Design a protein around this ligand. Structure first.
Ligand SMILES: [Mg+2]
Ligand SMILES: [Mg+2]
Ligand SMILES: [Mg+2]
Ligand SMILES: [Mg+2]
Ligand SMILES: [Mg+2]
Ligand SMILES: [Mg+2]
Ligand SMILES: [Mg+2]
Ligand SMILES: [Mg+2]
Ligand SMILES: [Mg+2]
Ligand SMILES: [Mg+2]
Ligand SMILES: [Mg+2]
Ligand SMILES: [Mg+2]
Ligand SMILES: [Mg+2]
Ligand SMILES: [Zn+2]
Ligand SMILES: [Zn+2]
Lengths: 61, 386, 131, 150, 136, 87
RNA sequence: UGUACAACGGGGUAUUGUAAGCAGUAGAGUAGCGUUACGAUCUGCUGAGAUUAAGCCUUUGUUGUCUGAUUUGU
RNA sequence: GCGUUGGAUUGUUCACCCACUAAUAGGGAACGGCUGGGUUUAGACCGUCGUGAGACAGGUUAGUUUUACCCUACUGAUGAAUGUUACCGCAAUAGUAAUUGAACUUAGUACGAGAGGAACAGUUCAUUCGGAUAAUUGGUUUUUGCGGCUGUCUGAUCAGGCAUUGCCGCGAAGCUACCAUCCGCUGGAUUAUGGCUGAACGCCUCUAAGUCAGAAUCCAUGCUAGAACGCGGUGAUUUC
RNA sequence: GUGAACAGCCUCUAGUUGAUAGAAUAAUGUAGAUAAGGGAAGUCGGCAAAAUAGAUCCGUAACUUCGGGAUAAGGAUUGGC
């Protein structure tokens, strides 16, 4: 979803030209990440070996 | 149907595309034809454009209305410190054109030219050519073999030189490196000259002299995105024309159902490679001359530098080339000065220039005085002097 | 640069210079010629009613009288008092032809000055009597 | 080739500088700057504008009559070229300029004598008229000296 | 560069386009000259032919003698108010634009010229220099 | 008028070019060569004065690095079938 | 960790046009008793004062700064 | 190949005059975007016709249509990947540009009863176009840099606010002007044509075989870009 | 307060400081200005802009229903003390 987006030099890390800084989306995803970390800690999993093995976003009503 | 009134088209179709140049240093696309009878000589030189000033010239031009009279002319000053020879490249001829066969470098390179190979100099370990320099040990085998290869196979010999940018007032510390073709004796003689001149400097008066015609090769001043009116010289549309008057009214009215490549469009102006020819050298000034801005008519002991220095550039402390008129590029830009590609047959190429006066007033305003001593002599004693 | 000064001091709208007016007022013959002008159909007032100090034609003698009873005319008359400031003054200020400037100044002080003053006085009384 | 003097402000006019206006009586007016040219077009008085040499000479800010100021004048009767005369002239010009600068410095010093006396009298009157601020100054200096001591 | 002109002419800033009115500096009876064409002018779309100092124009007399009016005559520009550069090193201009009536060979109709005459025009035209009392 | 590419004008230009213009070019070239030799000699003298205080077959490969790189490049071209001259 | 970089400061180079404060015997006159009071303005200290890179030049001064993040192998 | 103009005129111009100029050639890509004539609907008046509603042989005047952010084309600008990264280059292909007049000398010579009157070679400027450039001149000013003016407000001085950049003068820097300055070339192959040798055809013939020159023509030299899937030379190549 | 003035501009009492923000300053726009020399050569057409402007004094034609035209036109001036 990138038609008519400005270009930036910070996209060269991922080999693109179009990149942005969506603060609201980042905050929501950060909250979910913190919650997942808390759930793993309650389960007793090693926090240094955790990786995001599944993430899925679809459209709400 | 046909256009009612004829007019020449706007713009030159041979300078297309009007895009930004690939490098800030303009490429030399052609060198003078090599004559094997002549002694070895360089075909070009590198300088930095400092600014412009004014001269008075005593003209000797038979048949002219200004014969035996004075003329006021504009000149451009190019700061030209000696370049340093650091390499040699051999070129062979193939059915696909000229191909570089091998390159030989000098044993020791300075940090000025080492910085050209780095994007982040302050963080690097500065390892460039550190293993290449080890090939000069124990009689320099390998170096000798590559020089012999150039002698045996090359048809063109170029010498790699770099500018001494530390001598200029420029804030940039990275030097400029370029190939200059050697025109002179045999291929072996060119190779011997380059090898004996490794790590040595060449001054501008050992390439050019006074009253010579040269060519200026440089990238023009950039201007960014520009409309058609100033990009191509089109006429403005009448006042309050709908959708703008700084346009072309009709970009197409005929069958091809396309926009032609020959129609003026808005886009980049400036920052193009340009080669202008036949600029006469008015002075080859030495940097150690205390009065390189003085003439036989003007006895004022002064240098070429105007009061307050050249605007946005600074003082001239090295050898300089004063050519008449203007050259492409702006102040502090690197420029390449090339020998003429042909024997010019105009009398202006044979004229001898005698300068009567060189302007050294301040370029930072309406400069009225040539020297600070003259300014103090005119004004007198100020309040802070007593 | 600004529009008022541009459209007042355009070259095509230039006025006569103060040194020229001083030369006109210095000699009695010039004053007589400027007072007795030939009838010109292109001039205001048929070339009559001419103020020499301001170098200006009036449509009527009453207009000339009102002009004489005014501060603009007084301003010009005050301007026309001293040395006319030719190029020799600026040359002397720079230090050039100082003796020539001094000779001109003493000539103005001795001979040209009082004659011009007497001519101005005679012109003033003539205008007061006739107007 | 010749250095001209500005009609308005007497500044030197070098070749290719300023602008010239020719009047109907063949009088040339050379101006070193657009500033002087526009002042002339507005018909301002250079003897009333303070930044001009004409005003300075008229008001006595710098000396105007001297022996060193009579060596330069327009030469309407040329002389035959003589190499030794040219060399003598070239040395004499430097000597004359040095002497003129010395005399200008002396003139300015004579003009500005008395300033020290006036400034001293003003300072003395101010010190006499401000007793309370001096007491504040003494208190501040004493506190600073006590701080330095301890 | 015109018939009767002596030698080549170097470029001068153009001051008088077609439609301009200049003063008449000779004594033939004309008061002003109205420019209708410029001799030797170039061809370019939308560009007005313009005269400079020393150029020959075709002019009609607007103010002057009735016998002198209602005809087209050659004229030479001797003064212009647009500043132009002399190669000796100064830009200069006159108070007014002024010209003199001449024939196609460059010979003056009058016998004298009043007011200053530009050096360029006087050196270009020998008859102007012969009839000029003030040359710059 | 005669164009820049007019044959007779170019012939007259060549006749002129063979004379004084070429002679002046040759004299300038000789002077510049002499100045270049003088500059080299002066640099040699300065280097000697500075040091006063202090005191062939072209066959085969160029080097082992070149041999390894070129052999690997040709092997890669043969394996990937992207050679210009060899099937 | 240096012909290091920066923020200030200094010196040039320019633009404008003579700062604030004090004083005078200069000031058309008028009022009270030659003096004083008011007084546009004039004169002196004063080419003074102000600005000067933000895309000007230069720098023996003062005060600081030098550091994090990501990726890349035949 | 390269140019082919500036204007007057609508009681009509399906054109005609004046001038400049080297010259003011003809035409196609429509006639198989702004803008005036014109398909201009509702208002109105005059004329002709009609018994009338009305229509016209007609004449005059006034009268809202308003994309683009889509695809493509065009102009410029980035960019993944083939070990990485950096520097110096080559040139397939594409584009291409210069133009006209005058002047000195040749010369008052050739030619010519006279009146008149050239050119090549050697030199100097300018028209149109193109590419740059800002030393100088001019223009521009939110440098709100300096100064001044009106009205009001901060008690006065000083120092300042507001007046939709208040107004006036100068004004560096930058930008910019045929309103400023500079620069814009030389090798092969040809056309028309003029020839050589020479048959056809025991004469002859520039043509048939062969061959010499020759146009602002062509292809190059030179100039611009550089294949993002064309290429070469060279430097360095990681200690957790 | 200025001013003829409930005009325009500035201020006291009282009342607001609301209208998505931040960063840069390409082209083209919308709104507003300045420009050498010439002065309608532009254009179907002076469209649009520019120029004029308050007040005091002098002066003011044809025509006319005698009431007007008329601020006709054209000129001189304006601060402070
Ligand atoms: Mg958008
Ligand atoms: Mg241009
Ligand atoms: Mg400057
Ligand atoms: Mg047109
Ligand atoms: Mg209707
Ligand atoms: Mg010839
Ligand atoms: Mg105020
Ligand atoms: Mg034959
Ligand atoms: Mg590529
Ligand atoms: Mg204008
Ligand atoms: Mg018209
Ligand atoms: Mg037209
Ligand atoms: Mg009327
Ligand atoms: Zn008067
Ligand atoms: Zn001046």
């Amino acid at each position: 979803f990138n038609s008519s987006i400005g270009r930036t030099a910070q996209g060269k890390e991922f080999g693109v030209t179009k990149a942005r800084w969506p603060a609201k989306s980042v905050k929501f995803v950060q909250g979910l990440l913190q919650n997942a970390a808390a759930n793993a800690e309650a389960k007793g999993l090693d926090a240094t070996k955790l990786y995001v093995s599944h993430i899925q976003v679809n459209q709400a009503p | 149907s046909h256009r009612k009134y004829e007019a020449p088209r706007h713009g030159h179709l041979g300078f297309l595309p009007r895009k930004r140049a690939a490098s800030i240093r303009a490429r030399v696309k052609a060198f003078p034809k090599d004559d094997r009878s002549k002694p070895v000589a360089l075909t070009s030189f590198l300088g930095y454009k400092a600014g412009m000033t004014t001269i008075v010239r005593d003209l000797d031009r038979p048949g002219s209305k200004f014969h035996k009279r004075e003329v006021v002319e504009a000149v451009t000053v190019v700061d030209t410190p000696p370049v340093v020879v650091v390499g040699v490249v051999g070129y062979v001829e193939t059915p696909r054109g000229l191909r570089s066969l091998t390159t030989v470098w000098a044993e020791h390179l300075s940090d000025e030219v080492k910085r050209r190979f780095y994007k982040n100099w302050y963080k690097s370990k500065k390892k460039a050519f550190t293993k290449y320099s080890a090939k000069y040990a124990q009689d320099g085998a390998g170096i000798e073999r590559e020089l012999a290869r150039i002698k045996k196979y090359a048809s063109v010999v170029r010498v790699l030189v770099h500018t001494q940018i530390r001598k200029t007032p420029l804030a940039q510390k990275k030097a400029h490196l370029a190939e200059i073709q050697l025109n002179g004796g045999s291929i072996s003689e060119k190779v011997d000259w380059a090898r004996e001149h490794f790590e040595k400097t060449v001054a501008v008066d050992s390439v050019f002299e006074q009253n010579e015609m040269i060519d200026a090769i440089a990238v023009t001043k950039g201007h960014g995105f520009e409309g058609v009116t100033h990009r191509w010289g089109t006429k403005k549309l009448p006042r309050k024309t709908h959708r703008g008057l700084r346009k072309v009214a009709c970009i197409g009215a005929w069958h091809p159902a396309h926009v032609m490549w020959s129609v003026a469009r808005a886009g980049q102006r400036g920052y193009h490679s340009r080669t202008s020819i036949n600029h006469k050298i008015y002075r080859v000034g030495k940097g150690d001359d205390e009065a390189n801005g003085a003439t036989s008519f003007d006895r004022t002991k002064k240098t070429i530098t105007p009061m307050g220095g050249f605007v946005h550039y600074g003082e001239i402390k090295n050898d300089f080339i004063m050519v008449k008129g203007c050259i492409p590029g702006n102040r502090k830009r690197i420029v390449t000065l090339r020998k003429s590609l042909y024997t010019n047959t105009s009398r202006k190429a044979l004229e001898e220039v005698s300068l009567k006066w060189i302007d050294t007033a301040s370029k930072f305003g309406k400069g009225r005085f040539q020297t600070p001593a003259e300014k103090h002599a005119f004004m007198g004693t100020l309040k802070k002097d007593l | 640069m600004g529009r008022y000064s541009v459209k007042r001091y355009k070259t095509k709208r230039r006025t006569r210079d103060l040194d020229l007016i001083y030369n006109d007022l210095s000699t009695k013959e010039s004053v007589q010629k400027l007072l007795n002008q030939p009838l010109d159909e292109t001039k205001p007032g048929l070339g009559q009613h001419y103020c020499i100090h301001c170098a200006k034609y009036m449509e009527t003698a009453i207009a000339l009288k009102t002009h004489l009873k005014g501060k603009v005319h007084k301003r010009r008359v005050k301007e026309l008092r001293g040395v006319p400031y030719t190029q020799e003054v600026s040359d002397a200020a720079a230090g050039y032809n100082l003796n020539k400037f001094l000779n001109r100044v003493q000539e103005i002080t001795q001979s040209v000055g009082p004659e011009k003053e007497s001519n101005e006085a005679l012109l003033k009384e003539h205008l007061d009597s006739t107007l | 080739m010749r250095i001209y003097q500005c009609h308005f402000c007497s500044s030197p006019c070098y070749p290719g500088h300023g602008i010239m206006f020719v009047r109907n009586d063949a009088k040339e007016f050379r101006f070193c700057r657009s500033k002087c040219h526009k002042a002339f077009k507005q018909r301002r008085n250079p003897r009333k504008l303070k930044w001009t040499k004409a005003f300075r000479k008229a008001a006595g800010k710098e000396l105007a009559v001297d022996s060193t100021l009579t060596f330069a004048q327009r030469r309407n009767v040329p002389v035959r070229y003589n190499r030794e005369l040219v060399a003598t002239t070239l040395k004499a010009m430097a000597r004359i300029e040095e002497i003129r600068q010395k005399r200008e410095r002396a003139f300015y010093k004579n003009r500005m004598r008395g300033n020290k006396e006036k400034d001293f009298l003003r300072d003395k009157k101010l010190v006499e008229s401000n007793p309370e601020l001096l007491r504040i100054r003494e208190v501040e200096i004493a506190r600073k000296l006590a701080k330095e001591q301890e | 560069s015109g018939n009767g002109a002596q030698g080549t002419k170097f470029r001068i800033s153009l001051g008088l386009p077609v439609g301009a009115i200049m003063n008449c500096a000779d004594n033939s009876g004309a008061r002003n000259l109205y420019i209708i064409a410029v001799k030797g002018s170039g061809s370019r779309l939308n560009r007005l032919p313009a005269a400079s100092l020393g150029d020959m124009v075709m002019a009609t007399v607007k103010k002057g003698k009735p016998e002198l009016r209602k005809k087209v005559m050659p004229a030479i520009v001797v003064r212009q108010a647009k500043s132009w550069r002399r190669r000796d090193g100064v830009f200069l201009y006159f108070e007014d634009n002024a010209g003199v009536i001449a024939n196609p060979k460059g010979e003056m109709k009058g016998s004298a010229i009043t007011g200053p005459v530009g050096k360029e025009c006087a050196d270009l035209w020998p008859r102007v220099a012969s009839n000029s009392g003030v040359v710059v | 008028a005669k164009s820049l590419r007019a044959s007779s004008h170019l012939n007259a230009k060549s006749v002129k070019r063979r004379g004084v213009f070429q002679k002046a070019v040759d004299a300038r070239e000789q002077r510049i060569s002499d100045k270049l030799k003088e500059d080299l000699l002066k640099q040699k003298l300065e280097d000697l004065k500075k040091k006063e205080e202090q005191g062939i077959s072209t066959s085969g490969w160029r080097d082992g690095r070149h041999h390894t790189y070129k052999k690997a490049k040709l092997m890669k071209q043969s394996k990937k079938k992207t050679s210009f001259t060899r099937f």
